């Protein structure tokens, strides 16, 4: 139920910030769903965009 | 981007702050027409943009007809300078 981005009041991802992307991907590398992250619907799509970009850039593994 | 729009409206300005005045509008419509036409030549198959082009040219057409019925003088003085038949 808790919505991390609107709770801490932060704007768009700024994809370089690789620290929280770990918290938002599973240890397996699977991107966590809304049912567990509790984030807002509008922000989730730009999330998976950011994770996909950094994944292509090899900051996050495709599978761990 | 948007600078040609300002150029066109400012140079076709009839009333000091007119942005309706369909003689002004049809200028922007013609600009969009030929710009999207050069885009179509480089992408033949963009049928959705083709649909947008059809919509916008139809809009320009009925605007022209309305201006014709409103006054022939303004029509003629615009069509001759814009060169379209």
């Amino acid at each position: 139920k808790v919505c991390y981005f609107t709770s801490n009041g932060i704007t768009h991802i700024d994809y370089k910030d690789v620290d929280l992307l770990k918290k938002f991907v599973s240890e397996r590398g699977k991107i966590l769903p809304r049912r567990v992250t509790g984030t807002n619907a509008k922000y989730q799509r730009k999330l998976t965009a950011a994770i996909k970009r950094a994944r292509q850039m090899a900051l996050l593994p495709y599978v761990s | 981007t948007q600078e040609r729009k300002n150029q066109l409206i400012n140079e076709f300005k009839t009333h000091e702050s007119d942005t309706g005045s369909p003689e002004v509008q049809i200028a922007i419509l013609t600009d969009s027409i030929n710009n999207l036409n050069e885009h179509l030549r480089t992408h033949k198959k963009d049928h959705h943009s083709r649909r947008g082009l059809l919509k916008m040219v139809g809009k320009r057409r009925n605007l022209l007809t309305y201006l014709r019925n409103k006054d022939v003088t303004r029509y003629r003085e615009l069509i001759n300078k814009l060169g379209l038949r």
């Binding site: 994809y15 370089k16 970009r53 994944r55 292509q56 850039m57 090899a58 900051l59 996050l60 593994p61 495709y62 | -």
Partner: protein, 92 residues
């Protein structure tokens, strides 16, 4: 308004580092672009192997251009035998 990221493989002598980054910045500025800021990361264990390197060198080139220089950049980057990956983003 493009923020370019790219990687240069770890086994570069620090002599040739400055050469390669400097010539890339030369390409950007010569193709009409202007650098709004440069910035680096250095080492980081890659999330996965790419060719044979476990780690790599990470560099950032924050640039504002007319969107023609970066295509030439992409060509030069992919055709250089030493850079591994790179992308361009149109920052809004």
């Amino acid at each position: 308004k493009y923020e370019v990221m790219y990687i240069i493989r770890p086994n570069i002598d620090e002599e040739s580092k400055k050469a390669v980054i400097e010539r890339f910045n030369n390409v950007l500025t010569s193709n009409g672009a202007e650098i709004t800021g440069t910035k680096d990361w250095g080492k980081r264990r890659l999330a996965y192997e790419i060719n044979d390197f476990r780690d790599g060198f990470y560099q950032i080139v924050n640039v504002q251009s007319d969107a023609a220089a970066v295509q030439e950049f992409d060509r030069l980057a992919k055709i250089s035998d030493d850079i591994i990956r790179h992308i361009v983003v149109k920052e809004e």
